[PDB]
Amino acid sequence: NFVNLDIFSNYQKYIDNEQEVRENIRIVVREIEHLSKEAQIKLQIIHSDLSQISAACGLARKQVELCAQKYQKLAELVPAGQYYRYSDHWTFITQRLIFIIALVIYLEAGFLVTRETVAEMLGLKISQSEGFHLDVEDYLLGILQLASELSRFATNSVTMGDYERSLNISHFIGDLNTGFRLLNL
Amino acid sequence: NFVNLDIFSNYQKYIDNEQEVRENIRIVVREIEHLSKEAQIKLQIIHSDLSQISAACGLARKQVELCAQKYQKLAELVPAGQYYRYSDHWTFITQRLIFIIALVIYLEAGFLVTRETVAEMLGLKISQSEGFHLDVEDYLLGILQLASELSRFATNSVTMGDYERSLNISHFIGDLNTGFRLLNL
Amino acid sequence: NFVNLDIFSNYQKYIDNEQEVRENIRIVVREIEHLSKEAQIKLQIIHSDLSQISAACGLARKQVELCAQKYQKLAELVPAGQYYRYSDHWTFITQRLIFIIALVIYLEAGFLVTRETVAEMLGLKISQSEGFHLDVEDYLLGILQLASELSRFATNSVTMGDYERSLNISHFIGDLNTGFRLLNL
Amino acid sequence: NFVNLDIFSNYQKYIDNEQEVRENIRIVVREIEHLSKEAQIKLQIIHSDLSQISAACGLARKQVELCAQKYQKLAELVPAGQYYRYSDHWTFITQRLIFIIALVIYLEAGFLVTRETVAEMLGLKISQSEGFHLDVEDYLLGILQLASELSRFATNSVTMGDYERSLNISHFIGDLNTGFRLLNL
Numbered sequence: 001n002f003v004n005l006d007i008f009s010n011y012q013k014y015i016d017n018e019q020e021v022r023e024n025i026r027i028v029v030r031e032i033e034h035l036s037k038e039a040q041i042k043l044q045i046i047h048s049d050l051s052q053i054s055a056a057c058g059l060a061r062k063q064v065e066l067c068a069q070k071y072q073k074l075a076e077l078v079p080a081g082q083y084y085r086y087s088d089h090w091t092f093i094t095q096r097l098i099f100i101i102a103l104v105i106y107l108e109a110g111f112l113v114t115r116e117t118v119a120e121m122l123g124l125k126i127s128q129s130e131g132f133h134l135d136v137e138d139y140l141l142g143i144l145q146l147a148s149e150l151s152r153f154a155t156n157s158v159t160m161g162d163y164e165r166s167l168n169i170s171h172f173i174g175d176l177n178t179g180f181r182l183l184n185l
Numbered sequence: 186n187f188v189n190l191d192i193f194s195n196y197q198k199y200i201d202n203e204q205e206v207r208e209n210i211r212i213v214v215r216e217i218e219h220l221s222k223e224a225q226i227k228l229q230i231i232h233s234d235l236s237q238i239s240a241a242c243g244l245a246r247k248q249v250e251l252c253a254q255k256y257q258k259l260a261e262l263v264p265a266g267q268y269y270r271y272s273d274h275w276t277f278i279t280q281r282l283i284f285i286i287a288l289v290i291y292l293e294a295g296f297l298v299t300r301e302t303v304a305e306m307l308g309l310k311i312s313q314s315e316g317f318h319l320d321v322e323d324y325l326l327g328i329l330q331l332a333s334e335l336s337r338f339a340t341n342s343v344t345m346g347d348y349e350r351s352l353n354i355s356h357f358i359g360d361l362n363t364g365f366r367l368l369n370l
Numbered sequence: 371n372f373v374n375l376d377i378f379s380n381y382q383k384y385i386d387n388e389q390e391v392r393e394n395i396r397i398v399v400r401e402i403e404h405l406s407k408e409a410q411i412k413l414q415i416i417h418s419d420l421s422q423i424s425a426a427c428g429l430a431r432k433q434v435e436l437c438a439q440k441y442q443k444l445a446e447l448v449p450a451g452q453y454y455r456y457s458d459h460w461t462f463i464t465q466r467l468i469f470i471i472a473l474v475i476y477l478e479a480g481f482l483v484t485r486e487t488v489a490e491m492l493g494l495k496i497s498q499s500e501g502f503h504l505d506v507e508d509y510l511l512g513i514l515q516l517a518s519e520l521s522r523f524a525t526n527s528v529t530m531g532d533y534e535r536s537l538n539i540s541h542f543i544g545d546l547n548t549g550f551r552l553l554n555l
Numbered sequence: 556n557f558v559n560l561d562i563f564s565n566y567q568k569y570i571d572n573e574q575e576v577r578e579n580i581r582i583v584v585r586e587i588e589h590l591s592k593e594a595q596i597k598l599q600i601i602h603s604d605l606s607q608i609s610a611a612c613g614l615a616r617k618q619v620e621l622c623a624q625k626y627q628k629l630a631e632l633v634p635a636g637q638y639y640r641y642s643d644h645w646t647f648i649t650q651r652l653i654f655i656i657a658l659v660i661y662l663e664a665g666f667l668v669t670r671e672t673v674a675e676m677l678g679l680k681i682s683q684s685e686g687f688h689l690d691v692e693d694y695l696l697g698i699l700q701l702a703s704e705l706s707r708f709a710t711n712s713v714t715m716g717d718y719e720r721s722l723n724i725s726h727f728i729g730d731l732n733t734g735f736r737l738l739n740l
Contacts, residue, residue, distance in 0.1 A: 001665045001666065001723050001726055001727055002665075002666050002667075002730075003666070003667045003727065003730035003731060003734055004666075004667065005730075005733070005734055005737065007667065007669060007670070007734070008734035008735070008737050008738065009737060011691065011695065011738065012737055012738055014691060015738060015739065080636065080683070080684075081635065081636025081637075082636075082639065083639075084637065084638075084639035084640040084642075085639040087639075110556045110557075111556065111557050111558070111559075112557075112558045112559065112562065114562060115562070128635070129635075136566065136569060140566065151336045151337075151340065152336075154339070154340070154355065155336065155339070155355050155358045155359050155362070156359065157355075158352060158355040158356060158359060159355075159356070159359040163352060166351075166352070166355060167343060167348060167351070168556050170339065170340050170342075170343040170344075170351060171343060171344070171556055172556055172558065173340045174340050174341065174343060174344040175557075175558035175560075176558060177340070178560070179558055179560055179562070179563035180563070182560065182563050182564060182567055183563065183566065183567055183570060184570065186480045186481065186538050186541055186542055187480075187481050187482075187545075188481070188482045188542065188545035188546060188549055189481075189482065190545075190548070190549055190552065192482065192484060192485070192549070193549035193550070193552050193553065194552060196506065196510065196553065197552055197553055199506060200553060200554065265451065265498070265499075266450065266451025266452075267451075267454065268454075269452065269453075269454035269455040269457075270454040272454075295371045295372075296371065296372050296373070296374075297372075297373045297374065297377065299377060300377070313450070314450075321381065321384060325381065353371050356371055357371055357373065360372075360373035360375075361373060363375070364373055364375055364377070364378035365378070367375065367378050367379060367382055368378065368381065368382055368385060369385065521706045521707075521710065522706075524709070524710070524725065525706065525709070525725050525728045525729050525732070526729065527725075528722060528725040528726060528729060529725075529726070529729040533722060536721075536722070536725060537713060537718060537721070540709065540710050540712075540713040540714075540721060541713060541714070543710045544710050544711065544713060544714040547710070
């Protein structure tokens with residue numbers, strides 16, 4: 001009737017290390033939260049004060065690459081082919097970034113970003129294989145945010161009386177809406 | 186060292202009955218789902234085909250009172266002062282109804298309903314005390330839906346080219362948005 | 371196309387007050403957590419040190435009535451017939467108390483408590499109607515805890531070598547197990 | 556103001572395929588549920604009828620390898636180094652199997668299995684790298700189940716009066732309990 005307390009002790013070695021791996025991830029992603037959060041807090045203004053767009057974009061765009069670096073400590077910190085093991089840690093972060101970027105470009109140049117750009121722009125691989133990549137589901141979900149965010153924008157747009165800009169946003173949203181209908185539930 | 190299996194058997198009497206009380210609720214609310222669900226499915230059309238509004242409203246408005254009746258079996262089915270004990274069963278239902286009604290009136294007459302109306306309209310008490318009532322949080326949440334639904338409408342509105350109706354919805358949403366800012370997170 | 375911002379302002383009056391009602395509940399229940407938590411932390415000892423039972427029971431039993439008082443500020447703080455509206459706040463608390471009490475008595479006198487006792491013991495009404503009551507589902511769930519806790523106890527019992535006490539706990543658990551089989555899933 | 560509906564159409568190609576990959580997994584794991592579920596349903600008997608253990612073990616042990624095969628369609632069905640991408644599908648299944656196996660051996664030979672065995676026994680790699688592996692967290696969690704299941708067994712044991720077997724289970728549980736204390740919260 002025996003339990004061998006080596007099977008257990010020998011797992012406290014693995015766990016000890018896993019706690020730590022999972023810790024340095026938690027730590028880097030902690031800054032990337034922090035940075036991104038402030039680009040996001042700034043891009044806030046477009047709802048109350050149209051003039052300010054330009055600068056808010058400028059700032060966002062600064063952060064965005066101030067933290068394409070962080071995605072690089074993080075990058076080397078993830079072992080082997082084990083992205084998906086941890087990917088839970090940088091998914092909400094990576095989504096908010098896609099979203100942010102996507103918003104910027106739309107404000108800036110009035111059209112939808114490509115994954116391949118957001119990729120370059122964060123300094124991330126376009127696919128699985130060549131290294132630490134940007135996951136397609138994330139992209140798609142960042143874009144989802146965008147659409148929701150623009151709806152809020154079109155409505156604020158009207159209350160500040162930029163009636164026609166509102167109408168543009170709405171052409172555009174309805175465009176995503178059909179791009180999305182082209183997919184699923 | 187004794188457990189008295191009467192304390193237990195005597196609770197199988199209460200449980201037996203509670204299962205049943207909770208069952209006849211579940212059953213009525215099952216239809217009210219069913220009915221409401223179809224008003225909701227019909228009012229769907231306003232996004233693809235503006236002409237149809239009028240009829241969709243007519244139908245909704247039929248259902249709405251086809252099931253102000255159901256809220257009456259349900260009404261007498263709930264004992265004592267125990268609304269809140271079960272209220273979990275008719276909360277998502279009651280919310281969708283507020284929402285529906287609210288949408289109708291806005292389409293119909295272009296303004297925000299009063300709780301006191303939705304109340305009369307479902308045949309429900311305006312407050313706690315005079316009997317089976319319409320809960321304020323529910324109302325507020327039905328209205329929340331509305332706002333979200335109208336945003337979708339303003340955007341579809343533009344793709345069908347009713348540019349100015351779109352702009353109206355947006356004045357209105359922004360109106361709720363300030364009514365809501367007047368409250369909390 | 372009008373929203374009347376009185377319908378809204380007039381609800382900030384109700385909400386203001388509800389926040390507050392819900393706040394003084396949150397506050398009392400905050401102590402009852404605190405107290406109970408310490409009886410619970412003490413009754414911990416029975417797993418490592420059998421001698422200590424007696425004192426741990428003594429202490430628990432002190433707390434228990436040090437906070438049959440709190441259930442009395444709380445008591446008068448809840449309006450009308452609106453127990454169930456808030457009952458979500460004191461359910462995990464009230465469960466841990468039933469559990470605690472139940473454990474005490476079993477340790478003390480080796481048998482299962484009656485709801486009617488836990489009731490008197492916390493100074494709570496035996497039913498719905500005569501006032502602030504002890505809810506049957508809670509009781510039953512406190513007892514559930516008990517059974518789970520005793521299983522842990524029987525196993526610790528054996529490692530400290532009180533072989534026969536272990537066997538008693540097991541007669542008793544198996545007794546609840548049939549009391550419970552007498553009910554449902 | 557343009558959305559390019561190729562970026563979208565080109566993703567309906569990837570999604571189409573992902574739905575399908577994720578589908579053939581869902582399908583195999585559907586049987587492994589089915590099989591395992593029945594070994595589990597049989598090993599049930601040890602609580603009511605001690606004689607039967609031997610046969611229940613025999614049966615379990617049959618299933619176990621009737622579905623070390625399934626873990627082989629599944630095996631080749633998972634691409635590249637993407638275990639963790641899908642691993643969500645076979646985690647509750649793989650846990651119940653570890654648990655089952657672990658129970659069998661304990662019943663059979665009265666001691667705790669090694670991961671390396673459960674591995675061989677399901678025909679799974681001992682680590683990450685040499686191929687489709689058995690994840691350490693899963694193992695540990697299957698064992699957790701075991702302990703919980705044995706507690707139930709020790710208590711049933713006593714009601715059928717095998718007093719001393721009960722005491723053995725309890726030495727053993729308390730053994731795991733210290734193996735586990737040797738780890739974390």
